[PDB]
Amino acid sequence: MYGLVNKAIQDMISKHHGEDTWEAIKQKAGLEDIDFFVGMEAYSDDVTYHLVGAASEVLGKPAEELLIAFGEYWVTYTSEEGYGELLASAGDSLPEFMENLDNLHARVGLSFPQLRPPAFECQHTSSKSMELHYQSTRAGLAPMVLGLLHGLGKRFQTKVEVTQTAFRETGEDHDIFSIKYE
Ligand SMILES: C[C@H]([C@H](C(=O)Nc1cc([C@@H](CC(=O)O)C2CC2)ccc1Cl)c1ccc(Cl)cc1)C(F)(F)F
Ligand SMILES: [Cl-]
């Protein structure tokens, strides 16, 4: 993934648990070489997987929980690190933001040539409900989408309840989320 992801994890861990913990997570990840992450630089996906696995050990939390928390932190963090305007352009309500996802990724992919964006398909099901189909080149990140949705809820001051209705883990073609909202 691009450095920005890893920076965000470092920053989420650092603010919530201080620096020496970061550094131990870092060493346990096998990442002592690497001095700092470069935001626009492509890294191997394992750097991120190993960061998450190592934070899970050091902090005594499932990787999945850490992933939910990352998903919550990620929109706010990117909005403050140079992507504020861009996220603002993707809309003024949660459902408008969902529908703009693909066009947002098209714009992001101008600046990040090797972006592998996930596929998001949104069905507006009832008035306070949506169904979100999620397909990724990466495995295991459904809990992050959950947290991200919560983050979007907060962004647009909209109450959100999210339930995963289908899991790739059980052998379904893709992750599906039912989303109920304010
Ligand atoms: C709003 C965000 C959207 C984003 O995070 N997109 C995204 C997500 C991933 C996931 C994993 C994956 O499924 O491959 C990696 C972050 C771990 C990889 C590639 C991309 Cl382009 C987004 C956020 C900020 C900005 Cl600045 C632009 C886009 C979402 F996910 F909800 F769509
Ligand atoms: Cl990517």
> Closest Cα to residue 1, out of 75, 152, 140, 112?
112
Residue 117 CA, ligand 1 centroid: distance in Å: 7
CB 4 within 8 A of CB 78: yes
DSSP string, 44-92: -HHHHHHHHHHHHHHHTS-HHHHHHHHHHHHHHHHHTTT-HHHHHHT-S
Reported for 106-111, long-range contacts at CB under 8 A and 24+ positions apart, including other chains, are 111/40
Q: Which two tokens stand for residue 130?
A: 């949506």
Is ligand 1 within 6 A of the CB of residue 155? no
Which ligand lies nearest to the CA atom of residue 91 in the structure? 1
Binding-site positions for heme b read: 2, 74, 105, 116, 134, 136, 138
Is the CB of residue 105 below 6 angstroms from any atom belonging to ligand 1? yes
Q: Which ligand is nearest to the CA of 48?
A: 1
For residues 116 and 36, give the distance between their C-alpha atoms in angstroms, rounded to a whole number. Answer: 23
At position 99, the amino acid (one-letter code) is: E
38 C-beta closer than 6 A to ligand 1: no
Question: Ligand 1 centroid to 2 CA: how many Å?
Answer: 11
Which structural technique was applied? Answer: X-ray
Q: State how many domains the chain has.
A: 1
- For 153, the domain range is 1-182
Region class of 82: left (phi > 0), else alpha (psi between -120 and 50), else beta: left
In whole angstroms, give the CA distance from residue 21 to residue 29: 12
